[PDB]
Amino acid sequence: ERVGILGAGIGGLYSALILQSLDVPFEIIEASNRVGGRLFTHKFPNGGKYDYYDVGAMRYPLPKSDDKGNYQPGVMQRVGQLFTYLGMHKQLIPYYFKSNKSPGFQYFNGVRARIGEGSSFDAPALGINSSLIDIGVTKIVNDAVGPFAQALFDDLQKHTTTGWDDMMKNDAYSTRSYFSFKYLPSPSFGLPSEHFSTRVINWLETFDKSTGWYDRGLTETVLEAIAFGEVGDGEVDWRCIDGGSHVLPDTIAAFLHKKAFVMNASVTAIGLENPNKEDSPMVVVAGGQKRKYSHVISTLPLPVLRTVDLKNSKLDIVQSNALRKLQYGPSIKIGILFKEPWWTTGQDKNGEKFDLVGGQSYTDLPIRTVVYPSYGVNTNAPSNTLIASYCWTNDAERMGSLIGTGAATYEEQLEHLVLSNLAAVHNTDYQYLKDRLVDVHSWDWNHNPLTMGAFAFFGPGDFQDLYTSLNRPAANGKLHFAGEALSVRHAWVVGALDSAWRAVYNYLYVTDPAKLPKFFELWGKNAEWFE
Amino acid sequence: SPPGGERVGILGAGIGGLYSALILQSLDVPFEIIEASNRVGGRLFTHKFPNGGKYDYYDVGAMRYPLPKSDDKGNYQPGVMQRVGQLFTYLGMHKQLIPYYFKSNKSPGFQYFNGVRARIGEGSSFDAPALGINSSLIDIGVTKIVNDAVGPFAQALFDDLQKHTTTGWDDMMKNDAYSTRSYFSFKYLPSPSFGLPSEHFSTRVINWLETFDKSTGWYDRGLTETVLEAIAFGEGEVDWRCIDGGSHVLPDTIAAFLHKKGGNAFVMNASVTAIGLENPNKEDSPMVVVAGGQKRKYSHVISTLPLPVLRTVDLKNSKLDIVQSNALRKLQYGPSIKIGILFKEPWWTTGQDKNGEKFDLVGGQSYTDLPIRTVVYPSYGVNTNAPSNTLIASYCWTNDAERMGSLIGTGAATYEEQLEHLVLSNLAAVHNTDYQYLKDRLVDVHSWDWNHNPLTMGAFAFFGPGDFQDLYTSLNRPAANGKLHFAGEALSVRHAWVVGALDSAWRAVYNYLYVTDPAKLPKFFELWGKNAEWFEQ
Ligand SMILES: Cc1cc2c(cc1C)N(C[C@H](O)[C@H](O)[C@H](O)COP(=O)(O)OP(=O)(O)OC[C@H]1O[C@@H](n3cnc4c(N)ncnc43)[C@H](O)[C@@H]1O)c1[nH]c(=O)[nH]c(=O)c1N2
Ligand SMILES: Cc1cc2c(cc1C)N(C[C@H](O)[C@H](O)[C@H](O)COP(=O)(O)OP(=O)(O)OC[C@H]1O[C@@H](n3cnc4c(N)ncnc43)[C@H](O)[C@@H]1O)c1[nH]c(=O)[nH]c(=O)c1N2
Ligand SMILES: NC(=O)CC[C@H](N)C(=O)O
Ligand SMILES: NC(=O)CC[C@H](N)C(=O)O
């Protein structure tokens, strides 16, 4: 018995961690020279200890925890338990979703304000009546999303699936089409009992999410609200990893080596050695070499699997459709090393201090979201590194064209655009920021052969029609699909962990069911249902 | 009336900007074209393989034109693409138009779906029963089902063009909040003649429609785009044409036409970074364009820059209203990639598969659910003594192009090799050959991702639901006290077509003449049409 784990991301490392705790031989195959996958920390040369930024995962809305690292039940409990399992609980530092001092900025339609100041951002001129403005985007979206989210939260807490069954009856809706054809405002809002216009819906998307978010599945909007802790009775502890998210996969890998990795070997084929023999082993071609395994746990993204020769893996017609149709979403990040943390110590062109510690600013300008670092803020060498832009959907697609061109002329265009946008958001001059710029690093997860997209971001119908097919194995039960796409926590580490739990669960179920009690004891009776 | 210093700055030497200059030159209106790159044509982009023959090129962007019928003199019947046909005739290119074979001119192209291979027209179900598609839906077929849903909208829009009305568009806009998917999921009911249950299609069935009708993710964009695409494809009959030597001949011929009298020089290699009024408080303020680090002043400006490109330009002092500035961000663009491969021979025309069956393909296309999605065999040069050895091995849209894009333009040999092997493998499975049969014949590969290109920032406009009804009209109004005119194919209902760019230039110039020199309108109408879209009378 020997399990081939494809991909040394967090999902594959977690799978190996489970298999090692159960004394199951395994081997991890990784295409690159690095572990962590979309846990990717870039450290700027010539910078200080905290002059890094996380190009992928950077923030974890964990449940509350005690002094020993025991976490309350919650959406992200499995992530917290993983930290504690690895002895990392005390290495978790606060992540400030909002600024820890003065609030971050909002810059929309040329109107600048602080978060919480109640600006309308010229919405009346956009055709938003005063009643909608008074209610606000947040309350409106909560009224539409809340009912679905509460039912899904009840599923997790009460161990039911009726909430998901109801979500799936509405899975053909995008968030937009739900607002356009189904949602009617709560009578307490005192609004007309009619569906919102596209103008109003686009106003919601502008301040609620990203350009084009609402054209993807309504179910994803509901699941994101649950992941961000906008529903339920428990509160979240926003955390990040001291030194960058890379510490998590590096710590797991070091744990596994003291007891295994095939690096620099990209998988090009997966299939049964002989599809007609019932006891046929799996064959993985990686780095031009054939490797045999009893079972294979794949954590490769779905678009990557579409580049792998899966003949003799005997996918059924639904599984093969799912690999193509289950939708991914894009994302870009731009990190800038400055000479100082001007957002914390500086002032705008009028002498007003920014007074920002951690937190984020938002704008309809191309950069969309600015994320100020929470790590190291209280040390004697605070971070000088800013996430100048963090984009999703259309905003990331458009910005991606200026990233990774390899041409200085477009690198200069990109920097000038980002600094110009930053200047407008914070009310400074361009040169004030240019004089302080040291280095720029940019990344497009939608222009990366190892991800082929930032993460799963399902369109309408994906969850109800195609998602379950990939939780069934292929290759006569010997190929198991895992990775964050195989979860209801897309674009989160916990999604990858859930997928690894289910894949190993199915592996143990068909090969050594006597290990299930210990599996349940160490890693949970269920992937998602709360303890 | 018109000031003596009138001069229109045209931003972008693509087909929209070249057409604008052609109109203005015919009306004796001074202009100047500012272009960021060292080439003209924009998304008319022909790649010539150096080691190949005369017809060893492929069009990375525009390549096929569903024109109306035409007579021997180059007079085109009324139709969606008449404006394109007349442009060809105006430039003396009518006889340089050669057939474009949308379907193969000999044996049909291939379909390869769910591991089942068949020829177009053979009536295969591609294992759809295993997918849960009942026999009634299969017997009807995807094409008839889609036509039943799209037909009513398309017929109303065609009636608009022919009868010179807008009720068809107004009715389309009543449904513009629908994506194609949400329309099928929540509104469409099958025609009683189909004998199907009077219920909305399931997601499984809708995804079956998208699989064979368009591209992965197409149906999540606006229903209106699906309707407008069916109209553009001619669903009067169309004469599919392409341009001998590649689509680059069209913009090259316009540039030569504008240059004949020794003037109308183009400002090349000058990327626009700012557009605005010199003094937004003065009513007579001229426009200022900063391009290549130089300030240039114009009375009016016609922009053909893509909407995502305008979002990288400093538009302070252009005084866009709140709707216009929202439109620049939200009006959605779509992706596309193409992969051209020079082979040693036109094996699709002369070769045979692993079982000895000849492909016998001349022009036309093959389709598959594999990553390459669409294969396009060349129609140009097929009858000459040196036919093309160049294949469009992959032409993708939406999700298929987004995924494939990650393998294009990486700059690393290892990913160039991965890409080639994937493409050849897909091609081998589509045509029923082995990988090595195609590898032995491969000479050179060229790949392009219009969604990773600073000059386009997307392949073309591909609006989401609500874009046409909410934000589209805002950009047909000028900005900058009437002196900034938005043009380019995004400013049309023929997105992803040359005619869209031409329509946008007509409307922009029409608005310029309307506010600056109305005496030129009769000649403008005479030479370039009384309306942008309405059929000629
Ligand atoms: C921009 C951005 C931002 C965030 C996030 C993602 C992104 C892209 N996420 C999500 C989180 O990063 C993600 O869900 C998981 O890291 C995914 O882990 P997997 O193991 O599923 O895949 P992942 O892609 O990480 O790992 C797959 C592995 O397979 C390898 N591989 C690829 N092709 C191969 C081939 N052919 N052969 C062999 N190996 C191959 C890759 O190199 C990689 O090592 C996140 N999460 C969170 O909790 N908090 C957050 O704040 C964020 N934010
Ligand atoms: C892959 C693919 C395939 C097709 C098509 C497109 C694509 C991408 N099309 C659509 C057609 O190609 C397209 O609609 C028009 O060529 C667009 O012409 P525009 O003038 O609107 O823009 P276009 O993008 O062509 O021109 C804009 C110009 O502005 C320049 N520019 C950009 N940024 C600038 C800056 N900052 N400053 C100055 N200049 C700047 C660019 O370099 C370019 O010269 C098509 N159509 C058709 O009829 N038949 C077909 O078969 C196809 N197929
Ligand atoms: N849908 C998502 O949650 C994507 C965002 C990502 N999880 C983040 O924390 O930024
Ligand atoms: N929507 C579209 O028409 C995109 C396709 C493109 N016009 C072509 O025929 O190649």
Curated annotation (Swiss-Prot), chain B:
Q: What is the effect of changing residue 134 to A?
A: Lowers the glycosylation rate of LAAO4, decreases greatly temperature stability, but does not affect the catalytic activity
Secreted: present as a keyword of the record? yes
Q: Which GO terms describe its molecular function?
A: L-amino-acid oxidase activity
Checking Gene3D superfamilies in the record gives: 1.10.10.1620, 3.90.660.10, FAD/NAD(P)-binding domain
Q: How does activity depend on pH?
A: Optimum pH is 6.0 to 8.0.
- Residues that bind L-glutamine, according to the entry? 64, 395
Which residues are involved in binding L-lysine?
64, 395
Q: Where in the cell is it found?
A: Secreted
Give the protein's cofactors. Answer: FAD
* Annotated binding of FAD, by residue: 16, 35-36, 43, 63-64, 272, 489, 497-498
Practical use, per the record, is: Ammonia is critical for agricultural and chemical industries. The extracellular production of ammonia by yeast (Saccharomyces cerevisiae) expressing LAAO4 can be efficient approach because yeast can avoid growth deficiencies caused by knockout of genes for ammonia assimilation. Moreover, LAAO4 is able to produce ammonia from food processing waste, soybean residues (okara) derived from tofu production, demonstrating that ammonia production by LAAO4 is a promising strategy to utilize food processing wastes.
Q: Which GO terms describe its biological process?
A: amino acid catabolic process
Assigned keywords, A-Z:
FAD, Flavoprotein, Glycoprotein, Oxidoreductase, Secreted, Signal
Q: Which InterPro entries match?
A: Amino_oxidase (IPR002937), FAD/NAD-bd_sf (IPR036188), Flavin_monoamine_oxidase (IPR050281)
Q: Give the catalytic activity.
A: an L-alpha-amino acid + O2 + H2O = a 2-oxocarboxylate + H2O2 + NH4(+); L-lysine + O2 + H2O = 6-amino-2-oxohexanoate + H2O2 + NH4(+); L-glutamate + O2 + H2O = H2O2 + 2-oxoglutarate + NH4(+); L-arginine + O2 + H2O = 5-guanidino-2-oxopentanoate + H2O2 + NH4(+)
UniProt binding sites for L-glutamate: 64, 395
For this record, the Gene Ontology CC terms, alphabetical, are: extracellular region
Protein EC: 1.4.3.-, 1.4.3.11, 1.4.3.14, 1.4.3.2
Pfam families attached to this UniProt entry? Amino_oxidase (PF01593)
**What is the top-level taxon of the source organism?**
Eukaryota
Please tell me where L-phenylalanine binds in this chain: 64, 395, 496
| Function of the molecule | Catalyzes the oxidative deamination of L-amino acids with molecular oxygen to the corresponding alpha-keto acids and ammonia. L-glutamine shows the highest relative activity but LAAO4 has a broad substrate specificity, including L-amino acids with big aromatic, acidic and basic side chains. Methyl esters of these L-amino acids are also accepted, ethyl esters are converted but with lower activity, whereas D-Amino acids are not converted.
Q: Which family does it belong to?
A: Belongs to the flavin monoamine oxidase family. FIG1 subfamily.
Q: How does it assemble?
A: Homodimer.
Q: What is this protein called?
A: L-amino-acid oxidase 4
Source organism of the structure: Hebeloma cylindrosporum
